Design a protein around this ligand. Structure first.
Ligand SMILES: Cc1cccc(C(=O)Nc2cc(-c3ccc4[nH]ccc4c3)ccc2N2CCN(C)CC2)c1
Length: 304
């Protein structure tokens, strides 16, 4: 039954809205990005501040870790992505090609590719080793809110303000599936399940949906939260009970039972929109992050 997430740490340091928080795949770290143009690294278990990584000329929407936890990629309003050495804090590559703000980014599981989505309505696939753009997908007809690889990196899912989710063949760059639902509200977030079998999508009508994307069938929805404006990150939590975790525009983190769709916990504490949540890879730990009235990251721990 219910999780019992309690507040363990509040991480202050960013001087503007925080955009994204991500745990390293090794479970060691949390990375955060912010409108303040900075990436900060924190200890996942002790909340200790480790380092600040700088170099972007404008605010940063997203950050993501390579599979060996040695590299970070960030997506910035400055129209670039940057690849960072976590150890030195140094910018290794600047990925240039997008014609407007880059909103979202991920490594493939192999961590030889980066996928990016932009205000410029494209999705780009980049070679990690060289930093070169390998493919530009004419992905959507409005800003791209999220990009994610499946478990083997053979597929990419993207979401957009155009009301669509798309599934892409990574190797060829061909669209394999376009999802539509209801009256096509903006799709503000999407990701694959840990196994790759499903996609979880948020739309700006206060709804998360779980999809069997190949069958084109919605299996569950998660509602009760507030999501009408911001591109709020959501997650599968699989270390204990099977939960859906999301931020919300009423300053709370919402946790649902994945199967029953019931709200099982609401986490109070933040003082602005919780735009990002992350789930720890091995421990029942949530990181959550909030917008400019708050600017803090919170770490929470549960027994299941
Ligand atoms: C630097 C910074 C700090 C705090 C918040 C944001 C932000 O809200 N991000 C953003 C904006 C838009 C965005 C901005 C302006 C727009 N006009 C029309 C559509 C549209 C979308 C789309 C996606 C995203 N994100 C959210 C965070 N996530 C981890 C990745 C994606 C950025």
């Amino acid at each position: 039954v219910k999780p019992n997430y309690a507040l363990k740490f509040t991480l202050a340091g960013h001087t503007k809205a925080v955009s994204s928080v991500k745990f390293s795949p090794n479970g060691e770290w949390l990375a955060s990005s912010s409108a303040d143009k900075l990436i900060k690294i924190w200890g996942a278990y002790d909340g200790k501040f480790e380092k600040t990584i700088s170099g972007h000329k404008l605010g940063i929407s997203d950050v993501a870790w390579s599979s060996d936890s040695n590299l970070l990629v960030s997506a910035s309003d400055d129209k670039t992505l940057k690849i960072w050495d976590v150890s030195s804090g140094k910018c290794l590559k600047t990925l240039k090609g997008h014609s407007n703000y880059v909103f979202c980014c991920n490594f493939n599981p192999q961590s030889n590719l980066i996928v990016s989505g932009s205000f410029d309505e494209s999705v780009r696939i980049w070679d990690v080793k060289t930093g070169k753009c390998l493919k530009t997908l004419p992905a959507h007809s409005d800003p791209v809110s999220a990009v994610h690889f499946n478990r083997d990196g053979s597929l990419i899912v993207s979401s957009s303000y155009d009301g669509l989710c798309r599934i892409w063949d990574t190797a060829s760059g061909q669209c394999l599936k376009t999802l539509i639902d209801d009256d096509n509200p903006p799709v503000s977030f999407v990701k694959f399940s840990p196994n790759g079998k499903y996609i979880l999508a948020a739309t700006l009508d206060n709804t998360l949906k779980l999809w069997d994307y190949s069958k084109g069938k919605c299996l569950k929805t998660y509602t009760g939260h507030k999501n009408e404006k911001y591109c709020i990150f959501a997650n599968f939590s699989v270390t204990g009970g099977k939960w859906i975790v999301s931020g919300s525009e009423d300053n709370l983190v919402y946790i649902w039972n994945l199967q029953t769709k019931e709200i099982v916990q609401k986490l109070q504490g933040h003082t602005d929109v919780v735009i990002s949540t992350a789930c720890h890879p091995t421990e029942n730990i949530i990181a959550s992050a909030a917008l400019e009235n708050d600017k803090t990251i919170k770490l929470w721990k549960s027994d299941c």
